Amino acid sequence: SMTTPNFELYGYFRSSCSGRLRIAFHLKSIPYTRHPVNLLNTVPLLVVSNINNTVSPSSASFSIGQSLAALEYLEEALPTNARPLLPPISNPVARAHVRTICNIIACDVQPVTNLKIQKKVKALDGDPTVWSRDLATQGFGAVEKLLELSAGRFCVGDEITLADVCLVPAVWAAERVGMDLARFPITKRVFEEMLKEEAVQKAHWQKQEDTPEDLRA
Amino acid sequence: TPNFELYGYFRSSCSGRLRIAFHLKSIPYTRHPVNLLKGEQHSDTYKSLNPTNTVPLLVVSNINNTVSPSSASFSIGQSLAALEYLEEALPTNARPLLPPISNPVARAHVRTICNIIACDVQPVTNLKIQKKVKALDGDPTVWSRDLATQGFGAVEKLLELSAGRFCVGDEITLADVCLVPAVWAAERVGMDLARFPITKRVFEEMLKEEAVQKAHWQKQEDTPEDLRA
């Protein structure tokens, strides 16, 4: 097998969904072409080429506009990669726990606290910051109860999984609306352990090419 | 103890996904209806079933729980995780709902469709967010209709690339299982399904399936008499 997928990521330094993929690519040492897209229509968007597109066979590339599907694609399309981000298939219970945590974040927090929805909330004369902070706080409470069951060094045991990959950019996004991370001690410990990772530092929202100077670290 | 217990509600779209998947795969389960309109998920009987109190809740029993080994059960409060769990925990089931592992591109396409519904539509148009919108003095029905119309436009674009008889090719996948209750939820808020011709056709093809009829929101033990059909 001589199959070598080519990856290009249309992303944004501050997008929490783009940050999942940045983290996942660095942890797995998978080279990608970064195409920054300044949001101030889908971001992120991962374009995979040099593959068999079994959906659109005459097409050179295959697009994935949803970060969770893009993450699972990385797990499935690269079976020889030295770092799986899921427990193995023979452990469906641990995989379900990992996916539960990803879904609380990807389904219960991110979609109700993004720019699009904050704007809809301001259109109803609400306070988008308060709306987002209360929803993030509630979602992190559910994350924390699941981490009480599974966390070791990381969200699920002592290895990094997709759960930690989702957790990190969601902490960045939650802190921006003033959520107090200290309310969720296992989440906080796992977050900090993840920031010790060089791959997480390379994926950092303050450390990308399109990070504005005011925001750089 | 049953292998599977679904605490569901007849008109919950996430519960609908699970009912459809169980019928499609002929997997026996025990149904406990929890009336979300009466706030029954806060009652004492459902106390010890944490999460906090989510509907649907899938309780899985008689298993080796490799996360909490002192227990022979676990519960899953996220329908997407629960759907994937059925695929992996029952690998020899007569109806797999994802294309095989040797076609990761088609599994990615299926997951993308599920994610649009499960991430971009259902969370912003569910009962919790509608109540929040109502408290702002907005119209929750209009809010949800706009958001579902927008999500369906993105689904329809993906179906243009993949759909045959069903969402992805000619076989039922998890994309179809997510689509059906999403169409039910969207129509409930006045979305015009005819604007999305591929979605409409796939939805009508799914409604030909007896399993979908057994999972139908109008055909559950807890469907009120005036909503039955």
Author numbering:
A (entry chain B): 0 to 39, 55 to 231
B (entry chain A): 3 to 231
What does the paper behind this entry write?
Crystal structures are presented for a putative uncharacterized protein that shares sequence similarity with ζ-class glutathione S-transferases (GSTs) in both apo and glutathione-bound forms. Each protomer consists of an N-­terminal βαβαββα thioredoxin-like fold common to all GSTs as well as a C-­terminal α-helical domain. Based on sequence homology, structural similarity, half-site glutathione binding and sulfate ion H-site binding, the protein investigated here is likely to be a ζ-class GST/MAAI. Glutathione S-transferases (GSTs) are detoxifying enzymes that appear across a wide range of aerobic organisms, including bacteria, fungi, plants and mammals.
The 2.2 Å resolution apo structure contains two pseudosymmetrically related dimers in the asymmetric unit. The apo structure reveals a nonsymmetric homodimer with each protomer comprising two subdomains: a C-terminal helical domain and an N-terminal thioredoxin-like domain that is common to all GSTs. The C. immitis protein exhibits a nonsymmetrical dimer in which one protomer has several more ordered residues than the other; residues 39–52 are dis­ordered in the second protomer. All four chains in the asymmetric unit contain a sulfate molecule that binds to the backbone N atom and side-chain hydroxyl of Ser15 as well as the side chain of Gln124 and forms water-mediated interactions with several additional residues. A sulfate ion is observed in approximately the same orientation off Ser15 as in the H-site of the human ζ-class GST crystal structure and is believed to simulate the expected binding of the substrate dichloro­acetic acid.
